Structures are given as structure tokens and as C-alpha cells.
A paper describes a structure:
In some pathogenic microbes, the response to oxidative stress is controlled by a SirTM/zinc-containing macrodomain (Zn-Macro) pair responsible for establishment and removal of the modification, respectively. Strikingly, however, the “catalytic loop” found in all other MacroD-type enzymes (also termed “loop 1”) is replaced with and extended loop containing the zinc-coordinating Cx(4)HxC motif, here termed the Zn-loop. To gain a closer understanding of the functional role of the 3α-bundle and coordinated Zn2+ ion, we solved structures from the three sub-branches of Zn-Macros namely from S. aureus (SauMacro), Methanobrevibacter oralis (MorMacro), and macrodomain-fused SirTM protein (Mfs1) from Fusarium oxysporum f.sp. cubense race 1 (Foc1Mfs1) in their apo form as well as of S. pyogenes (SpyMacro) and MorMacro bound to ADP-ribose (ADPr). In all structures, the Zn2+ ion is tetrahedrally coordinated with three metal-coordination residues within the Zn-loop, while the fourth coordination-contact is exchangeable and is provided by either ADPr, a water molecule, or a symmetry-related protomer within the crystal.
His118 (SauMacro) coordinates the Zn2+ ion via the sterically more demanding, but tighter coordinating, Nδ1 nitrogen. The Zn-loop appears to be partially stabilized by contacts with the 3α-bundle. Among these residues, Arg42, Asn46, and Asn123 (SauMacro) are among the most conserved and make backbone contact to the loop and among each other, thus establishing a tight packing. The diphosphate-binding loop supports ligand binding and can transition between an open and closed confirmation. However, our data do not support this binding mode: first, the different orientation of the diphosphate-binding loop in our apo structures shortens the cavity, which would sterically hinder the binding of the dithiolane moiety. Among these mutants, zinc coordination is strictly associated with catalytic activity, thus demonstrating a direct role of the Zn2+ ion in catalysis. Deletion of the N-terminal 3α-bundle (ΔN, aa 1–70) leads also to the loss of zinc-coordination, which is consistent with our structural observation that the Zn-loop is partially stabilized by the 3α-bundle.
Numbering used by the authors: -6 to 264
Write the structure that this text describes.
Amino acid sequence: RGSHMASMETLKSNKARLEYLINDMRRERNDNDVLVMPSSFEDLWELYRGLANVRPALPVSDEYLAVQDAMLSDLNHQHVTDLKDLKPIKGDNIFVWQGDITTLKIDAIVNAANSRFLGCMQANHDCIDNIIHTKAGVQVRLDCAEIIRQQGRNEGVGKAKKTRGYNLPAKYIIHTVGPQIRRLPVSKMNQDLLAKCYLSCLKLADQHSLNHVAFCCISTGVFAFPQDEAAEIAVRTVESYLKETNSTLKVVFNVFTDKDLQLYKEALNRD
Ligand SMILES: [Zn+2]
């Protein structure tokens, strides 16, 4: 695998970087008991990730960031997808793309954050918030913490805040908190709030003169907005915004599942 593609030196170096990062985070927690450091890249990664996910938003040394950034940049740029190589599915300005949002070269990706705004603090959890934070680096959690400290309160639903993307190929991450759905059918208030997430993100991207923005599937997963309904709100809000403002923004709907992928194509077909 690695030999023909010349990957072996980088694998051995990335493993050494993970062990350094793991050791530093364990020392900080006063986990002084000597753990069995796994041999594999995969098992090292899941150990590192769990430790990063749970770490409170406390200062980090420049030495730690040097190692973390070398490792994260190498991993995120290995199989990068550039927006310039994709083609619009609608007009010249709307794309649908199945893939990992943390590997897309684009001005901004949109994070489905929570109101505490530090990322996902559940070890090794499969949500978008966790994945974005983990691949981007600890600097995102620290920047988020500073945003919350300066505003004196948790983040409300339907807003947008921008941070740098750090180790991601994305220049920026736009963080929005989507509505939590408990009861069905979805209230008009909650439908309006999900729309507001998209609008807020679009407005902020145009406010900063960005050329492109990729959305994930906001309020799906644990917030558990019904899928078909969310897709419909996403598409309708985007197309309305682009039409009414004559924005030059290019908008990517990032999906992972084939179910979502079909939902998005169907929504963009129906007029
Ligand atoms: Zn999570």
C-alpha cells in the first residue's frame, strides 16, 4: 500500500507525533499510570482523538501546537478535494458533494455546533462537530471559548460565528447552532430557526466576501430534525437567498450517506 505511494516515512513520523501528543495530554490530566501505547496508526489516532475531545479549553503550548499542526496538516491534505475540480448540479453556483468535509478546499465549511460552542466533548463520537474540531485542531475550541467568554453567554440558535479552519484545507469554519427537535411534527418556530441557521451562515460568508461555503446537514443526527424536511429547508433557503441577493457565492451541500445524497438531488430538481 504505502511503499508504492512512498508513504512509509510519513506514517512512522505521524505515529511518533501522536505518541507525543497523547503523552502530553495524559500528563496534563495527571494520568501518570503507564499505558500500553498501541503500535498501529489507527489505535493511536482513536486514543489521541478521545483525549482531544474531552480536554477543557485550557491554554496550550506553542510546542504542542507545532507537533499537532504538523500531524493534522499532513493527515488532512493527503486526499484533498478541490471545489475547482467539481461541477455545479444547479445553475453555476450550487453543488452536491459526497465526501469528508474536513478534506474539502473551500473558503468556508459550516459546523453544526452546540450552544456551549466548544465542540463535541464525547470521546470518539461520530458527529460533525467532533470531526471538524478534531481535524482542525485544538485552536478552534480555544477560539470558540474566547467568543463565548467575550459575549458572556452561551450561543443562541440560528446564528453564525466564524473562526479560522487551521489544519483543515478550508480557510474558515462558520459555526451555527441548529434547533433541537423533541416532538413531532416540527413546529413552525423550529422550521423558521433552521432556515435562520442557513441564512445567518450565507449572510456572514457574503459579509466577509468569501467565494464559497459548504454546508453539512444541520440539525440531523442527535438534534434529530427529520431528514427530508431538513433537506427541503436547506435547499429552499439557499436558493431563495441566492436569487434575492444575486450573491456570487458558490454553495456546496456536503453529504455522506446515499440517502442524503438522493434527498438533495431530488430537492434541487423540484420547482
Ligand atoms: Zn458529538
